[PDB]
Amino acid sequence: PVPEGVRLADGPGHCKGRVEVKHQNQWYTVCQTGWSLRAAKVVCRQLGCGRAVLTQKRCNKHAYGRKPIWLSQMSCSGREATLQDCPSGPWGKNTCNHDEDTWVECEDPFDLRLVGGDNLCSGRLEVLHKGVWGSVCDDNWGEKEDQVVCKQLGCGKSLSPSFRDRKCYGPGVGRIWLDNVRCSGEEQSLEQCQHRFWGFHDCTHQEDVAVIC
Amino acid sequence: VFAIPPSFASIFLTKSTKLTCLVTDLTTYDSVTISWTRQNGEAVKTHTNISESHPNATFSAVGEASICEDDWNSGERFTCTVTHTDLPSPLKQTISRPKGVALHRPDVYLLPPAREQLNLRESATITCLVTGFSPADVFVQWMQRGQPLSPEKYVTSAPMPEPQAPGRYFAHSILTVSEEEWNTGETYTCVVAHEALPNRVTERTVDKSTGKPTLYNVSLVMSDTAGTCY
Amino acid sequence: VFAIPPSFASIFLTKSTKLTCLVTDLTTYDSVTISWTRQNGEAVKTHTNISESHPNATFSAVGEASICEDDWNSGERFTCTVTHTDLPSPLKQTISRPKGVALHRPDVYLLPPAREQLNLRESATITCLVTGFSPADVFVQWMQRGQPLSPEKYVTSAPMPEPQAPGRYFAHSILTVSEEEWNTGETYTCVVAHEALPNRVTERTVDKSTGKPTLYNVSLVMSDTAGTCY
Amino acid sequence: ERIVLVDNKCKCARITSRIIRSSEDPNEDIVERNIRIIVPLNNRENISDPTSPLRTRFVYHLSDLCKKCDPTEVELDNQIVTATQSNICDETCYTYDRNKCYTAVVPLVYGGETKMVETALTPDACY
Ligand SMILES: *[C@@H]1O[C@H](CO)[C@@H](O[C@@H]2O[C@H](CO)[C@@H](O)[C@H](O)[C@H]2NC(C)=O)[C@H](O)[C@H]1NC(C)=O
Ligand SMILES: *[C@@H]1O[C@H](CO)[C@@H](O)[C@H](O)[C@H]1NC(C)=O
Ligand SMILES: *[C@@H]1O[C@H](CO)[C@@H](O)[C@H](O)[C@H]1NC(C)=O
Ligand SMILES: [Ca+2]
Ligand SMILES: [Ca+2]
């Protein structure tokens, strides 16, 4: 029972689709009796595709064609990284129903691009929560946010500028994905900072923030 | 006899539409027919997915068929034929989705436990008052600190019609927590799922600190030079 | 003949334990000799106003023996003696008050309507929370100012098992009222009829002002000398 | 232990709630509600229009302050769904907000150009 990889195919996206499984070149697919969201939280963690959103045990019309049902049973906690960290004891135990397949709609992961500037290390901030790129707001912006986003950018440390280059690097246009983002200084990236809900902003596009480092 | 439909509880929590009829052990039969037949006539195959485990327990099984298409949401005359040679009359049951029921959003009210109840210092009953929903089926789950509470902690009633309203229903959900949890100020959130809700789920939270206050202390600082808030 | 026993709600609304041997599972036939006999070996004046013939695989003759409260709870095994063509023997079903049930009094809590309900200004739902009672026989009726409201205005859920307690039950009963009636301030008494209460009736009451004073501590700070800092 | 119930910086109302651990018995601990409201004595009715008349009546619907119309996420067994937190909603702004900078446009004439330049109604807000 070695799940090397669990690809997501037959779906609109790279990591939105049905769950497969790979062992010893045999591409196989997984049914499960207890197939919760935490299993998808594992599955879109070992692939590194965002947080897990939806986990449908949704059947389709029978002419799809499908691989057989994976031999072991996979029930675990969900806080772990890969499909090897939790046990898959009952090998050869196929107690799914007749013709069904699972489905995961985990998010595309957080790609963060500093746009509008001459270099990629200096520009207005733009983030990717959904498929649409969008800026973030400067409500209660702090130097902890600057050092967190520069740590995630992999581009050194902030210098805390005098706001003139940030106002000169562009107002931007589009949508504002984040407002009132608040980083504690220790988070690896911008998702793990406290913020208002994605896309719910009380600011216009004139308040798009820029981080210089 | 029973044929439990997928409600909005089974639709939303599990994301799997399972047609289920329960064949109680009236008499032991070898080839128990729990064949879930469509109005079209094709049968999505189910057989003994879980035993009934009734007090008699004489060859009783539950057949759950995953007709998970849009044909249930649109609607069809689905029939499981509980036809048996023992008691030779076929004790079948037919269930369909109820058609054209008007959709009104639930107004969800979270009632804190009574002051009379906390004086006993034994248990606190938090009431989730889901009322005003005209489609009958509703799913109510309690969470504390973002973790789903166990279903033995809370008990939710069947929806019954609201008295003054014509066809709108109401439901309760009584969460029985110990008094030392509620008096320390622990947030108990009522997650309720309904079709007529815009985001499909409403979360009311209650705790002692929000509650009903027993000492408002207001300070209307009328300052000339306020201008911007600080 | 399935004889429906007189529930505590049925003997409380009428104040007369009218136990009924309604002729169920026996079709319409001749040779009517229906008599309710007490277990000592006698019989009383029985079946006033039996209904007509309804051959929908049953009948409609009703037992109307006006025995007393001291008769029903005495444990006397009352037997109806319906004879018909299908069975020429008195179907002496044993109906009496069971003594195996524990007798724990309800803890009746009367939660006021939520502040959102009065904020919406169309309805207020006062919920009576009858919880912690061992026999599942509770009659809840509401009085406005000492006289009962109509049973259409309130709805009482069936007694359901309290999950943490082993065999105790709970029941919740709302009464949907107008917001303007509750803002005037009325007693809105919830009367709970149950066997284990010391006087068989408890009553709880919520007015518009039913809590603590909630004392206000307002401070119009009308200068910048005492104006706040950040 | 003053948990911040609202921190509305547009009407300046701050509401904070705490359980005062007053007595030994855990019931009479008073749920204390601290409404702190700053009333701008000289701000106009429309803050963004500096020629608007002086704001005299300051009405604060405290239910409108305490509404939470940002949908939150909840974690079900099979799904993460956005969850509405209130039934109220489906803005006067007595005071300016510190984080938000408000600009008004004035007609500036020199030789009849009427070049409409934006001011800063709140200086040291976007500098
Ligand atoms: C508050 O004042 C602002 C600024 O004068 C008003 O905004 C302008 O309103 C006019 C008429 O509605 C529009 O033609 C302009 O395009 C607006 N300008 C801007 C920058 O928004 C605003 O309408 C006023 N609000 C109220 C309630 O009086
Ligand atoms: C409200 O009462 C508290 C004591 O309970 C007191 O400390 C406070 O100063 C009062 N608030 C005023 C006077 O604004
Ligand atoms: C309410 O009372 C507390 C004392 O417990 C005091 O510190 C606080 O300032 C008061 N609230 C306001 C708004 O003045
Ligand atoms: Ca903000
Ligand atoms: Ca800002």
CSV table of N, CA, C and O in Angstrom, one decimal, chain C residues 103-186:
chain,number,residue,atom,x,y,z
C,103,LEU,N,-40.0,8.4,37.6
C,103,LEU,CA,-40.9,9.5,37.8
C,103,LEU,C,-40.0,10.7,38.2
C,103,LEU,O,-39.8,11.0,39.3
C,104,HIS,N,-39.4,11.4,37.2
C,104,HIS,CA,-38.6,12.6,37.4
C,104,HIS,C,-39.3,13.8,36.8
C,104,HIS,O,-39.8,13.8,35.7
C,105,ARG,N,-39.3,14.9,37.6
C,105,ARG,CA,-40.1,16.0,37.3
C,105,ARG,C,-39.5,16.8,36.2
C,105,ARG,O,-38.2,16.8,36.0
C,106,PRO,N,-40.3,17.5,35.3
C,106,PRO,CA,-39.7,18.4,34.3
C,106,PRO,C,-39.0,19.6,35.0
C,106,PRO,O,-39.4,20.1,36.0
C,107,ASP,N,-38.0,20.0,34.3
C,107,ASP,CA,-37.3,21.3,34.7
C,107,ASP,C,-37.7,22.3,33.6
C,107,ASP,O,-37.0,22.3,32.5
C,108,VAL,N,-38.7,23.0,33.8
C,108,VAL,CA,-39.3,23.8,32.7
C,108,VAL,C,-38.7,25.2,32.7
C,108,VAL,O,-38.7,26.0,33.6
C,109,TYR,N,-38.0,25.5,31.6
C,109,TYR,CA,-37.4,26.8,31.4
C,109,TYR,C,-38.1,27.5,30.2
C,109,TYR,O,-38.4,26.8,29.2
C,110,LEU,N,-38.3,28.8,30.4
C,110,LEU,CA,-39.1,29.5,29.4
C,110,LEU,C,-38.2,30.6,28.8
C,110,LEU,O,-38.1,31.7,29.4
C,111,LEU,N,-37.5,30.4,27.7
C,111,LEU,CA,-36.6,31.3,27.1
C,111,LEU,C,-37.4,32.4,26.4
C,111,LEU,O,-38.4,32.1,25.7
C,112,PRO,N,-37.0,33.7,26.6
C,112,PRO,CA,-37.7,34.8,25.9
C,112,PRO,C,-37.4,34.8,24.4
C,112,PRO,O,-36.4,34.1,24.0
C,113,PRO,N,-38.1,35.5,23.6
C,113,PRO,CA,-37.7,35.6,22.2
C,113,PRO,C,-36.4,36.3,22.0
C,113,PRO,O,-36.0,37.2,22.8
C,114,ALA,N,-35.7,35.9,21.0
C,114,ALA,CA,-34.4,36.6,20.7
C,114,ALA,C,-34.6,38.0,20.3
C,114,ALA,O,-35.7,38.4,19.8
C,115,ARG,N,-33.6,38.8,20.5
C,115,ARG,CA,-33.7,40.3,20.2
C,115,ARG,C,-33.8,40.5,18.7
C,115,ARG,O,-34.3,41.6,18.3
C,116,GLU,N,-33.3,39.6,17.9
C,116,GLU,CA,-33.5,39.8,16.4
C,116,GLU,C,-34.9,39.6,16.1
C,116,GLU,O,-35.4,40.3,15.1
C,117,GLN,N,-35.7,38.7,16.8
C,117,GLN,CA,-37.1,38.5,16.5
C,117,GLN,C,-37.9,39.8,16.7
C,117,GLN,O,-38.8,40.1,15.9
C,118,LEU,N,-37.6,40.5,17.8
C,118,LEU,CA,-38.3,41.8,18.0
C,118,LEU,C,-37.7,42.9,17.1
C,118,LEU,O,-38.3,43.9,16.9
C,119,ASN,N,-36.4,42.7,16.7
C,119,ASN,CA,-35.8,43.6,15.8
C,119,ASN,C,-36.4,43.5,14.4
C,119,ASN,O,-36.5,44.5,13.6
C,120,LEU,N,-36.9,42.3,14.0
C,120,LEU,CA,-37.5,42.2,12.7
C,120,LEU,C,-38.9,42.7,12.7
C,120,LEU,O,-39.5,43.1,11.6
C,121,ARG,N,-39.5,42.8,13.9
C,121,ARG,CA,-40.8,43.5,14.1
C,121,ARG,C,-42.0,42.8,13.3
C,121,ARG,O,-42.9,43.5,12.9
C,122,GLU,N,-41.9,41.5,13.2
C,122,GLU,CA,-43.1,40.8,12.6
C,122,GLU,C,-43.6,39.7,13.5
C,122,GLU,O,-44.8,39.3,13.5
C,123,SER,N,-42.7,39.1,14.3
C,123,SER,CA,-43.0,37.9,15.1
C,123,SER,C,-42.0,37.7,16.2
C,123,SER,O,-40.9,38.1,16.1
C,124,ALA,N,-42.6,37.2,17.3
C,124,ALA,CA,-41.8,36.8,18.5
C,124,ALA,C,-42.2,35.4,18.9
C,124,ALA,O,-43.4,35.1,19.0
C,125,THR,N,-41.2,34.6,19.1
C,125,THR,CA,-41.4,33.2,19.4
C,125,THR,C,-40.9,32.9,20.8
C,125,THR,O,-39.7,32.7,21.0
C,126,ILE,N,-41.8,32.8,21.8
C,126,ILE,CA,-41.5,32.4,23.1
C,126,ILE,C,-41.4,30.9,23.2
C,126,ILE,O,-42.4,30.2,22.9
C,127,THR,N,-40.3,30.3,23.6
C,127,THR,CA,-40.1,28.9,23.6
C,127,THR,C,-40.1,28.3,25.0
C,127,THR,O,-39.3,28.8,25.9
C,128,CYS,N,-41.0,27.4,25.3
C,128,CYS,CA,-41.0,26.7,26.5
C,128,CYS,C,-40.1,25.4,26.4
C,128,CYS,O,-40.4,24.6,25.5
C,129,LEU,N,-39.2,25.3,27.3
C,129,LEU,CA,-38.2,24.2,27.2
C,129,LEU,C,-38.4,23.2,28.3
C,129,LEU,O,-37.8,23.3,29.4
C,130,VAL,N,-39.3,22.3,28.1
C,130,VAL,CA,-39.6,21.2,29.1
C,130,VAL,C,-38.6,20.2,28.9
C,130,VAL,O,-38.6,19.4,28.0
C,131,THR,N,-37.6,20.1,29.9
C,131,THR,CA,-36.5,19.2,29.8
C,131,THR,C,-36.3,18.4,31.1
C,131,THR,O,-36.6,18.9,32.2
C,132,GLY,N,-35.8,17.2,30.9
C,132,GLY,CA,-35.3,16.4,32.1
C,132,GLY,C,-36.4,15.6,32.7
C,132,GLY,O,-36.3,15.3,33.9
C,133,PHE,N,-37.4,15.1,32.0
C,133,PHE,CA,-38.6,14.4,32.6
C,133,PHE,C,-38.6,13.0,32.1
C,133,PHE,O,-38.4,12.8,30.9
C,134,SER,N,-38.9,12.0,33.0
C,134,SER,CA,-38.7,10.6,32.6
C,134,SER,C,-39.9,10.0,31.9
C,134,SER,O,-39.6,9.2,30.9
C,135,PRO,N,-41.2,10.1,32.2
C,135,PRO,CA,-42.2,9.6,31.4
C,135,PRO,C,-42.6,10.5,30.2
C,135,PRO,O,-42.8,11.7,30.5
C,136,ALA,N,-42.7,10.0,29.0
C,136,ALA,CA,-42.9,10.8,27.9
C,136,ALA,C,-44.4,11.2,27.7
C,136,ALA,O,-45.1,10.8,26.7
C,137,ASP,N,-44.9,11.9,28.7
C,137,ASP,CA,-46.3,12.3,28.7
C,137,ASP,C,-46.3,13.7,29.3
C,137,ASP,O,-46.4,13.9,30.5
C,138,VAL,N,-46.2,14.7,28.4
C,138,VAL,CA,-46.3,16.1,28.8
C,138,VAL,C,-47.3,16.8,28.0
C,138,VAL,O,-47.5,16.6,26.8
C,139,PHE,N,-48.2,17.6,28.7
C,139,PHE,CA,-49.1,18.5,28.1
C,139,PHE,C,-48.8,19.9,28.4
C,139,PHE,O,-48.8,20.4,29.5
C,140,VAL,N,-48.4,20.7,27.3
C,140,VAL,CA,-48.0,22.0,27.4
C,140,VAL,C,-49.1,22.9,26.8
C,140,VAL,O,-49.5,22.7,25.7
C,141,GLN,N,-49.7,23.8,27.6
C,141,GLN,CA,-50.6,24.8,27.1
C,141,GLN,C,-50.2,26.2,27.6
C,141,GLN,O,-49.5,26.3,28.7
C,142,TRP,N,-50.5,27.2,26.9
C,142,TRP,CA,-50.1,28.6,27.2
C,142,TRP,C,-51.3,29.4,27.6
C,142,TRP,O,-52.4,29.3,27.0
C,143,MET,N,-51.1,30.2,28.6
C,143,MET,CA,-52.1,31.2,28.9
C,143,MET,C,-51.5,32.6,28.8
C,143,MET,O,-50.4,32.9,29.1
C,144,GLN,N,-52.3,33.5,28.2
C,144,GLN,CA,-51.9,34.9,28.1
C,144,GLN,C,-52.0,35.7,29.4
C,144,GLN,O,-51.0,36.1,29.9
C,145,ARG,N,-53.2,35.8,30.0
C,145,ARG,CA,-53.4,36.5,31.2
C,145,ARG,C,-54.3,35.6,32.1
C,145,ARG,O,-55.2,36.1,32.8
C,146,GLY,N,-54.0,34.3,32.2
C,146,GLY,CA,-54.7,33.4,32.9
C,146,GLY,C,-55.8,32.5,32.2
C,146,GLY,O,-56.2,31.5,32.7
C,147,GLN,N,-56.1,33.0,31.0
C,147,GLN,CA,-57.0,32.2,30.1
C,147,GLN,C,-56.2,31.6,29.0
C,147,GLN,O,-55.2,32.2,28.5
C,148,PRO,N,-56.6,30.4,28.6
C,148,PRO,CA,-55.7,29.7,27.6
C,148,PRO,C,-55.8,30.3,26.2
C,148,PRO,O,-56.8,30.7,25.8
C,149,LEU,N,-54.6,30.3,25.5
C,149,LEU,CA,-54.6,30.6,24.1
C,149,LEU,C,-55.2,29.4,23.3
C,149,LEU,O,-55.3,28.3,23.8
C,150,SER,N,-55.5,29.6,22.1
C,150,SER,CA,-56.0,28.6,21.2
C,150,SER,C,-54.8,27.6,20.9
C,150,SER,O,-53.7,28.0,20.8
C,151,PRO,N,-55.1,26.3,20.7
C,151,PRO,CA,-54.0,25.4,20.3
C,151,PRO,C,-53.4,25.6,19.0
C,151,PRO,O,-52.4,25.0,18.6
C,152,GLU,N,-54.0,26.4,18.1
C,152,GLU,CA,-53.4,26.7,16.8
C,152,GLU,C,-52.2,27.7,17.0
C,152,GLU,O,-51.3,27.8,16.2
C,153,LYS,N,-52.3,28.6,18.1
C,153,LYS,CA,-51.3,29.6,18.2
C,153,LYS,C,-49.9,29.1,18.6
C,153,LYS,O,-48.9,29.7,18.3
C,154,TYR,N,-49.9,28.1,19.4
C,154,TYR,CA,-48.7,27.5,19.9
C,154,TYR,C,-48.5,26.1,19.2
C,154,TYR,O,-49.5,25.5,18.8
C,155,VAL,N,-47.3,25.6,19.1
C,155,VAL,CA,-47.1,24.3,18.7
C,155,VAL,C,-46.0,23.6,19.6
C,155,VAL,O,-45.0,24.2,19.9
C,156,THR,N,-46.4,22.4,20.1
C,156,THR,CA,-45.5,21.7,21.0
C,156,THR,C,-45.0,20.5,20.2
C,156,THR,O,-45.7,19.7,19.7
C,157,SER,N,-43.7,20.3,20.3
C,157,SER,CA,-43.0,19.1,19.7
C,157,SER,C,-43.3,17.9,20.5
C,157,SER,O,-43.6,18.0,21.7
C,158,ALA,N,-43.2,16.7,19.9
C,158,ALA,CA,-43.3,15.5,20.6
C,158,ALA,C,-42.2,15.3,21.6
C,158,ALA,O,-41.1,15.9,21.4
C,159,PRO,N,-42.4,14.6,22.7
C,159,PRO,CA,-41.3,14.3,23.7
C,159,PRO,C,-40.2,13.4,23.0
C,159,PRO,O,-40.5,12.3,22.6
C,160,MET,N,-39.0,13.9,23.0
C,160,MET,CA,-37.9,13.2,22.3
C,160,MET,C,-36.9,12.9,23.4
C,160,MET,O,-36.8,13.5,24.4
C,161,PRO,N,-36.0,11.9,23.2
C,161,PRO,CA,-35.1,11.5,24.2
C,161,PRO,C,-34.0,12.5,24.4
C,161,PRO,O,-33.3,13.0,23.4
C,162,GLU,N,-33.8,12.9,25.6
C,162,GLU,CA,-32.7,13.8,26.0
C,162,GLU,C,-31.4,12.9,25.9
C,162,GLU,O,-31.3,11.8,26.4
C,163,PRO,N,-30.4,13.3,25.1
C,163,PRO,CA,-29.3,12.4,24.7
C,163,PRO,C,-28.3,12.1,25.9
C,163,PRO,O,-27.9,11.0,26.0
C,164,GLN,N,-28.0,13.1,26.7
C,164,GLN,CA,-27.0,12.9,27.8
C,164,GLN,C,-27.6,12.1,28.9
C,164,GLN,O,-27.0,11.2,29.4
C,165,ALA,N,-28.8,12.5,29.3
C,165,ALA,CA,-29.5,11.7,30.3
C,165,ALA,C,-30.0,10.4,29.8
C,165,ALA,O,-30.2,10.2,28.6
C,166,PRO,N,-30.0,9.3,30.6
C,166,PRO,CA,-30.3,8.0,30.1
C,166,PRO,C,-31.7,7.8,29.5
C,166,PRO,O,-31.9,7.4,28.4
C,167,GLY,N,-32.7,8.1,30.4
C,167,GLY,CA,-34.1,7.8,30.0
C,167,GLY,C,-35.0,9.0,30.1
C,167,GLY,O,-36.2,8.9,29.9
C,168,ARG,N,-34.4,10.1,30.5
C,168,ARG,CA,-35.2,11.3,30.6
C,168,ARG,C,-35.5,11.8,29.2
C,168,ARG,O,-34.7,11.6,28.2
C,169,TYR,N,-36.6,12.6,29.1
C,169,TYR,CA,-37.0,13.1,27.8
C,169,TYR,C,-37.0,14.7,27.9
C,169,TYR,O,-36.9,15.2,28.9
C,170,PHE,N,-37.1,15.3,26.7
C,170,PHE,CA,-37.2,16.7,26.6
C,170,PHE,C,-38.3,17.1,25.6
C,170,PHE,O,-38.5,16.3,24.7
C,171,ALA,N,-38.8,18.3,25.7
C,171,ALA,CA,-39.8,18.7,24.7
C,171,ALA,C,-39.8,20.3,24.7
C,171,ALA,O,-39.8,20.9,25.7
C,172,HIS,N,-39.9,20.8,23.5
C,172,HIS,CA,-39.9,22.3,23.3
C,172,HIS,C,-41.2,22.7,22.7
C,172,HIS,O,-41.6,22.1,21.7
C,173,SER,N,-41.8,23.8,23.1
C,173,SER,CA,-43.0,24.3,22.6
C,173,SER,C,-42.9,25.8,22.4
C,173,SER,O,-42.7,26.6,23.4
C,174,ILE,N,-43.0,26.3,21.2
C,174,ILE,CA,-43.0,27.7,20.9
C,174,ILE,C,-44.4,28.2,20.8
C,174,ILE,O,-45.4,27.5,20.6
C,175,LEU,N,-44.5,29.5,21.0
C,175,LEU,CA,-45.8,30.2,20.7
C,175,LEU,C,-45.4,31.5,19.9
C,175,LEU,O,-44.7,32.4,20.5
C,176,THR,N,-45.8,31.6,18.7
C,176,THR,CA,-45.4,32.7,17.8
C,176,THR,C,-46.4,33.8,18.0
C,176,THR,O,-47.6,33.7,17.7
C,177,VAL,N,-45.9,35.0,18.6
C,177,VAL,CA,-46.8,36.1,18.8
C,177,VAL,C,-46.3,37.3,18.0
C,177,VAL,O,-45.2,37.3,17.5
C,178,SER,N,-47.1,38.3,18.0
C,178,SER,CA,-46.7,39.6,17.3
C,178,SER,C,-45.7,40.3,18.2
C,178,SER,O,-45.7,40.2,19.4
C,179,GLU,N,-44.9,41.1,17.5
C,179,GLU,CA,-43.9,41.9,18.2
C,179,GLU,C,-44.5,43.0,19.1
C,179,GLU,O,-44.0,43.4,20.1
C,180,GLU,N,-45.7,43.5,18.6
C,180,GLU,CA,-46.3,44.6,19.3
C,180,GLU,C,-47.0,44.1,20.6
C,180,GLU,O,-47.1,44.9,21.6
C,181,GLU,N,-47.4,42.9,20.6
C,181,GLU,CA,-48.0,42.3,21.9
C,181,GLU,C,-46.9,42.1,22.9
C,181,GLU,O,-47.2,42.3,24.1
C,182,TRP,N,-45.7,41.6,22.5
C,182,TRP,CA,-44.7,41.4,23.5
C,182,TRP,C,-44.1,42.7,24.0
C,182,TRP,O,-43.5,42.8,25.1
C,183,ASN,N,-44.1,43.8,23.2
C,183,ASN,CA,-43.6,45.0,23.6
C,183,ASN,C,-44.5,45.8,24.6
C,183,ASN,O,-44.0,46.6,25.4
C,184,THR,N,-45.8,45.5,24.6
C,184,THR,CA,-46.6,46.0,25.7
C,184,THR,C,-46.3,45.4,27.0
C,184,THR,O,-46.3,46.1,28.1
C,185,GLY,N,-45.9,44.1,27.0
C,185,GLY,CA,-45.6,43.4,28.3
C,185,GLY,C,-46.7,42.6,28.8
C,185,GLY,O,-47.7,43.1,29.4
C,186,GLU,N,-46.7,41.3,28.5
C,186,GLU,CA,-47.7,40.4,29.0
C,186,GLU,C,-47.1,39.2,29.7
C,186,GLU,O,-45.9,38.9,29.5
